[PDB]
Amino acid sequence: MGFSLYTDDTVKAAAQYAYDNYLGKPYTGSVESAPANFGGRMVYRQHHGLSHTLRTMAYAELIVEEARKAKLRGETLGKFKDGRTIADVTPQELKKIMIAQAFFVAGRDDEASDAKNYQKYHEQSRDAFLKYVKDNESTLIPDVFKDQEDVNFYARVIEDKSHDWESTPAHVLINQGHMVDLVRVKQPPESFLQRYFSSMQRWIGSQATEAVFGIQRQFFHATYEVVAGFDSDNKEPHLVVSGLGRYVIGEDGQPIREAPKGDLKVFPQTYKLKENERLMRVDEFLKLPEIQNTFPGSGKHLQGGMPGMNEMDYWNRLNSLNRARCENDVDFCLKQLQTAHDKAKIEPIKQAFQSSKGKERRQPNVDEIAAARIIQQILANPDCIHDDHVLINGQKLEQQFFRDLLAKCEMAVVGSLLNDTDIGNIDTLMRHEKDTEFHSEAVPVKIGEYWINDQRINNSSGNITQKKHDLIFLMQNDAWYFSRVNAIAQNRDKGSTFKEVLITTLMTPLTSKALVDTSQAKPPTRLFRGLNLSEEFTKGLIDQANAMIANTTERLFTDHSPEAFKQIKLNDLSKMSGRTNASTTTEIKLVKETWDSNVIFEMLDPDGLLHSKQVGRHGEGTESEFSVYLPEDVALVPVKVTLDGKTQKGENRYVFTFVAVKSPDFTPRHESGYAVEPFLRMQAAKLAEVKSSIEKAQRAPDLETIFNLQNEVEAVQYSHLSTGYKNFLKNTVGPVLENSLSGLMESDTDTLSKALAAFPSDTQWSAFNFEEARQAKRQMDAIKQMVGNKVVLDALTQCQDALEKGALDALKKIPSEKEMGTIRRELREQIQSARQELESLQRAVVTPVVTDEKKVRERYDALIENTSKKITELETGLDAVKKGISNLSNLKQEVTVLRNEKIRMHVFSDVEKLEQQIQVIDTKLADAYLLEV
């Protein structure tokens, strides 16, 4: 949105005119200019064609943008005769500059040499410009320009009767924008790159110009033109481009001009005679201290061509279709330039942080498991809810608990945990509730009646998927509901009842089961949402967004990734669009109140990181709506903030474009046990009650009946009565007594439990004596009860003590399962074992430091280095110092960022502590300094 090269139609029309009438037309002159044939399609003018001029216009917009970025970082900028700088260029002015720029080389009827007919060519081009203003004065003169005086101004700029500048709009951008595009061919590339870099640096600064050349390379690649290398160790004779001259290194040194004080400037002449001396090499030139300080190209880096396909694939690529396509089709070339440009807007952000190692959405952790289970219980048993709190297995759950759930838990994953039975229990929940829910002063709605009514009148079948569509429908267009929901979820709500909080907490994962319906709704890469905010808050947003934007610039020689990392980490990171089910649209028609939204979020997820699903389908009308619960890995980083039109209510509106970037650097550390600890308390309460019941039921362990029975097993062998009975007592019951007794005396074991498993059942035994083996049966069953009780009870105790501190607990329950215990109490302890099992097996803990551990360490080094540099530099040095104080202040938070990062690196802060100590002393120093003046 706003004004751009690619969006605007007038500029494009001008370019199409320029191509159709001159640039597309063949060179009519005799100078070495022939039609180049590219894969069948011919381009007549390759050096000064359509790709060229379009590239210049792109260069212009790019320059303006990076100038603005430089001003934002607080860089002292090159000013003109008026107070204006390049960063002060008006969008309208820019349109003028670009429309003029279209015709800059329209004049050439041949490839101009060093011959001076070039002047005539420019005049010819001017003529073309004028003819393109007279073509449609109606739609162009009162609108785009002002008067034909203006038009003759730009016409005169295109004339270039003299090498003019100081004119902020046209002169610098057109002249420099033109001469820059010739880097691809000019012979010693290092000297030319340095010259142009210095030249533009005077206007924009080192960083921003570095960015402009960096993106220029990508433009070249996009328009399928050669990208030249850069070798700091170049041995070629350095060429002074300002003229045809070269520096001459005489014996012992380089011949410089007359002193005239004493640091005399290096003198250079054209092709002269050699007198036991040679011309200065490129590397030699680059090694000069003034150069080394002025130019970031001391680094031997920068390799020509494209990274990869080092073969002749590059030259065939340049000899291919796309070169002809870029040179003959305006919209296509513009598409190339814009895609490269936006890519350039995104790449440094991604270069700042660790890479997404797949893992699109996270796997549930312990707390989210426990929370999902608690929620499941509250849905299943709405009796848990009270006017103030939710009681559950003897555990009081206040409002702050559910708020903490909304904050800490990622409710989309929690949603993944839930099932259709819960979506069904929404009915029982709303049945239990008939309490009012408040908008953000209007009349409240009795939610219960609302849902119940909806379901009984429009869902007689009681179908669960229908329940899901109805729930989502409530999310979409019921303001009173979703205002409270979104607010409470994002912790920006006013005075709201506990039950509103509870309901939102339950409903956000259930609504996040919008995933179940229309899962194959492909995330749309472009999504808008509208927001109405105070001008103060809006200004704050603008400042933070800009703080991030200004410090993301494309890499050339210097890095600048740690500053980007820092500023992004510090500023909002857009929490304002997370922790709830945010409604979004692609059509730029708002869900509600389009007329009031003064801030608009344009969201871009080309990587599909935003797991967004559509609200409503292709049926029931054309639906262009989506819901988003942005995952904690994904951050929304601002790329541009533009003005665009104004709204009707009088508020000036702004649009912030964010791009979805996923990285573990964004995953938040959370204190474990906000949900799982009280959950464990609940379990502990269950088992405490069961143990109390058994222990009160228990009779004192009379060991006699074991001993006595033992005597009988040893006695029956000598009674000569029944051999089968003898055999069964000595070979089956005897060992059971021995092992169950030895087990019972010693602590809990597998021996006594498996002794309990080896027990002789009632299915047997019946075939034996009924007169006196009856009492044997009696005694043995008494021991059945003794052992079952003992095992269960001490197992329970062990478990409870285990829970007092988590995994060690679940294993303890395994032996006791099958035998003994009164009915239903066993089923209870089984339920608890089931919950324990759920946590123990489904828990997973993700890490904020992935494969790029190298990156995290190196980047930390760079970070603390840069911070140290800024801080120590600031401790050395009337008007300026005032801003210097703010400069001090931001550094504090930079140090805090460093600290937290060092924390995150090891899931020992000496140096950072030292920097803090620096911060205190220069705090006092600058305080006394600020007080003095």
Short mmCIF file of C-alpha atoms in Angstrom, two decimals, residues 430 437-439 445 447 450 471 474-476 478-487 503-504 506-508 511:
data_model
loop_
_atom_site.label_atom_id
_atom_site.label_comp_id
_atom_site.label_asym_id
_atom_site.label_seq_id
_atom_site.Cartn_x
_atom_site.Cartn_y
_atom_site.Cartn_z
CA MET A 430 -23.91 -23.63 29.11
CA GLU A 437 -21.58 -11.68 29.86
CA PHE A 438 -20.63 -8.06 29.36
CA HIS A 439 -19.52 -6.25 26.19
CA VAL A 445 -26.22 -11.38 27.18
CA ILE A 447 -24.62 -16.82 27.45
CA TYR A 450 -27.90 -18.00 24.02
CA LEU A 471 -18.98 -22.08 18.41
CA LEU A 474 -20.15 -17.18 18.05
CA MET A 475 -16.47 -16.21 17.78
CA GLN A 476 -16.97 -14.39 14.49
CA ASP A 478 -21.06 -11.65 18.46
CA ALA A 479 -19.25 -8.52 19.68
CA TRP A 480 -20.33 -8.77 23.30
CA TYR A 481 -18.69 -12.18 23.45
CA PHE A 482 -15.48 -11.88 21.45
CA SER A 483 -14.58 -8.44 22.82
CA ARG A 484 -14.49 -9.90 26.34
CA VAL A 485 -12.82 -13.06 25.09
CA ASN A 486 -10.06 -11.33 23.14
CA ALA A 487 -9.48 -8.80 25.94
CA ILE A 503 -15.49 -19.17 30.18
CA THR A 504 -12.88 -17.51 27.93
CA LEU A 506 -12.31 -22.91 28.51
CA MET A 507 -13.49 -21.65 25.13
CA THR A 508 -10.25 -20.48 23.51
CA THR A 511 -12.66 -22.53 19.54
#
